Symmetry: D2
């Protein structure tokens, strides 16, 4: 588990369940290439995106599909997605947890980075 | 010297007509009323105090979030938000809060 | 585990370890009475505050000692504490997780409430 | 029609001299430069666009948080913050962001 994503819903006070998450990695030609994707569980967590072998150094983008989440709850949200873009593993492998907190017109994200 | 600004993360708007009470901690560790008001159409509450009144000490800003949410028909978690801080050269304090039904964030802008 | 507290540090990207947490409950005479206290672990979590028997309906205050946390890291913070005040168990027992994210001049908190 | 405001949660201040670039999504799903500037002493960036230029569509506001933190000597996690949204009666948009080294929050104030 070198990359984990956790999503919470600030309106309902609950995990944000069935949220699609797409991860990209910057290629040598400076475009975003697909890297991994998945969906949050009933706990709001997404494990198993990648492996220690696959998760090399690079610039990664995690795009959390908040628009589809809100629309499925019958709410018209503001943002297309929540995200982080970050350089990973530059000083060696780390474990990253990306935690996102969602409201219809707002989001916040934090990273928890541990060594391992 | 002290301004409060409140935003609503659900509706994407200023939080209007929110009651705010400020207290200063007394020598017996109790909370003495100090200033209060309601946020304006811009979500701001100006005019709470004067330089001469606002001395160093511990202050509590209580934002009545529960009444706010209920007046909008939205189910809230917190009773209120209580933002407690120590006031310590030339300085103006803005206490800013961003509200959601089951979460809030606050930050201080000290200039 | 009907009440859990998790604290994260937004400056370091880490759990906030060894953070004191004090929980109070409003008494019949409208004052705050002590209810429980503890400290976050190396994961930033605090389990074992209370029990299903002890955690009755009431208005609770969770005071997270953020000032001592920052001061121990050699930083002068703004707030005395991070907190939540909430009515608990009004529609029957629930499990509450209070998640706090700390910066020297800011904090945010969220509640995750589950039935169980 | 579009304003950006940035706050610093570490120093308790406006985030001053932060580069901001706005992009509009083109028909081929690429990001076409639209507006840019640097936040002022108040943390605000006004004058990005005009009513006639700001049409419905998908916009990205990229805030260069990494350069901000490094100019303050503080070690940052994100490359930048990318705030992407759809613009849809009379409306003004404020994109507000609160920055910490390993976290940011953003909200929209639509009036
Ligand atoms: O599991 C989580 C998710 C989000 C969190 N958060 C993000 C911003 N504020 C809290 C905290 C913990
Ligand atoms: O969680 C927050 C709070 C305040 C914010 N802000 C208010 C004014 N400028 C940024 C943004 C995000
Ligand atoms: Ca390297
Ligand atoms: Ca002093
Ligand atoms: Ca009851
Ligand atoms: Ca339309």
């Amino acid at each position: 588990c070198p990359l984990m994503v956790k999503v919470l819903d600030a309106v309902r006070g609950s995990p944000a369940i069935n949220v699609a998450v797409h991860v990209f990695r910057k290629a040598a030609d400076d475009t975003w290439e697909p890297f991994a994707s998945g969906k949050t569980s009933e706990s709001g967590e997404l494990h198993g995106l990648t492996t220690e072998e696959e998760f090399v150094e690079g610039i990664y983008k995690v795009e959390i599909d908040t628009k589809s989440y809100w629309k499925a709850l019958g709410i018209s949200p503001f943002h297309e997605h929540a995200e982080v873009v970050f350089t990973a593993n530059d000083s060696g492998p780390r474990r990253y947890t990306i935690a996102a907190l969602l409201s219809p017109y707002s989001y916040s994200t934090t990273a928890v980075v541990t060594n391992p």
